[PDB]
Amino acid sequence: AAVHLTLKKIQAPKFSIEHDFSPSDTILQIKQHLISEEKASHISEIKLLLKGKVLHDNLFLSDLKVTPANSTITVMIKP
Amino acid sequence: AAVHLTLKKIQAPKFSIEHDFSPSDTILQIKQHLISEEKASHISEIKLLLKGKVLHDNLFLSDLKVTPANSTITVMIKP
Amino acid sequence: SASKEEIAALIVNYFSSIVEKKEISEDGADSLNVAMDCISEAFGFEREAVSGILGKSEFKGQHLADILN
Amino acid sequence: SASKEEIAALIVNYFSSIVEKKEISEDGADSLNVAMDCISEAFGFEREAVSGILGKSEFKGQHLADILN
Amino acid sequence: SASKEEIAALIVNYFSSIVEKKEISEDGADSLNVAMDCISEAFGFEREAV
Amino acid sequence: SASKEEIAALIVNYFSSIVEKKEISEDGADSLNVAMDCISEAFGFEREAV
Predict the structure, then answer these.
(1) Measured distance CA(C65)–CA(A24) in Å, rounded
(2) For the domain F1-50, what is the CATH code?
(3) Which residue of F has its CA nearest to C58?
């Protein structure tokens, strides 16, 4: 059952985008999505956080225990 | 018109007593009352305060702007 | 970097913590209440102003800078 | 005498003062909010626990003793 | 770690230095002298003892 | 009299020493590194500048 995530980048220039992922997707897949959306060029440029926790690539989305449609992943990008 | 004052000593052994004074009485008169009540032997042994202000003997009770019946003078006694 | 007024307010704030949390006998709370009024009178602030004084971002930041040197 | 946890809580408290009082742009408040969550996570306390941590008589008294030396 | 009496005694010491250097008015000093006695009482020691 | 940037740079310096001495976990350090970048942004300087 899909997880509707918001991906919010606060570093100027900010963005906020949305996408449905599977609970069985990994953090790596969310970074791969960001590259598909041309927000970055390589996964190494991207950090993702849930609240103050930096999320490692191997984590499964279901491990985050986010809500089905109300949660936001913070995006840090260093080119 | 009389001022009904409460005179409260917090230093153990505590006391709390009441007396009506005139607005034209002075702070000296209240210390003299305390001696009349055998709470002390000389006015020099007594300090009086209203909230955090130490009251000088020459002050008039009307200068304190206390309420007619709800105010308390703190009493410190050093024998 | 704390002013004597700021220090006095910290002292009042400490005694206030004890009285509010009932960490002292009632007679001891009465004594600290007199002490808090006297300090406030001596340093020229209202006892009720203490939270505001210690609550300024400016004070918090400077005190943090003192701590972090 | 402050622990690194107490220092972290002071820092979170300072940024919280800025955000609460709206002393920064909305985008800057968003950045400090992320920063406050990261600090809280790093030092093992909940962000909502900070007031309680700094509010203990014990902390206030020790910090006062540090200040008064 | 400072005991409650030690904290109270440092506070009394701080106020004594403010009065002794005349950093506030004489009326202010009056009030701080009363404070110091109430603080000594609250924390169960004598001011002289500080 | 410390400016807001000065305060922010002292904070960044404090966190950098915690990370560098490994006083919290590697995951903690990850989080503090993100904090430091957000702090630098909030107060209008670059972290390298600190």
Answers:
(1) 46
(2) 1.20.5.420
(3) F4
Pair type for strands A46-50 and A53-54? antiparallel
Q: Tell me the technique behind this structure.
A: X-ray
Domain limits, chain F = 1-50
What is the resolution of the experimental data for this entry, in Å?
A: 1.8
Distance in angstroms (rounded) separating the CA atoms of residues A23 and D18: 37
Find the closest chain F residue to A52 by CA distance.
Answer: F31
- Structure tokens, A9: 């980048």
Rounded distance between C-alpha atoms, residue F6 and residue F10, angstroms: 6
Give the residues across from B76 on adjacent strands: B47
What's chain F look like in SS3? CCCHHHHHHHHHHHHHHHHHCCCCCHHHHHHHHHHHHHHHHHCCCCCCCC
Is residue D32 a contact partner of residue F38, using CB atoms and an 8 Å limit? yes
Neighbour count for residue D34 (Cβ, 10 Å): 25
CA E4: distance to chain centroid?
14
Question: What is the set of domains in chain A, with CATH numbers?
Answer: 1-79 (3.10.20.90)
Contact residues of F toward C, CB < 8 A: 1-2, 4, 6-7, 10-11, 13-14
Chain B: partners with 3+ C-beta pairs within 8 Å:
C, E
- Nearest residue of C to residue D22, measured between CA atoms: C57
Residue with tokens 């609970």: A23
The angle formed by the CA atoms of residues C24, C43 and E28, to the nearest 5 degrees, is 95
Q: Which residues of chain F are within 8 Å of residue C67 when distances are taken between CB atoms?
A: none
Pairwise CB contact (< 8 Å): F41 & A12:
yes
Dihedrals phi, psi of D44, to nearest 5 degrees = 85, 20
Q: Does the beta-carbon distance from E13 to D61 stay under 8 Å? A: no
Architecture of domain D1-69: Up-down Bundle (1.20)
Cβ pair E38:C24 closer than 8 A: no
Whole-angstrom distance, CA of residue B27 vs CA of residue F11: 55
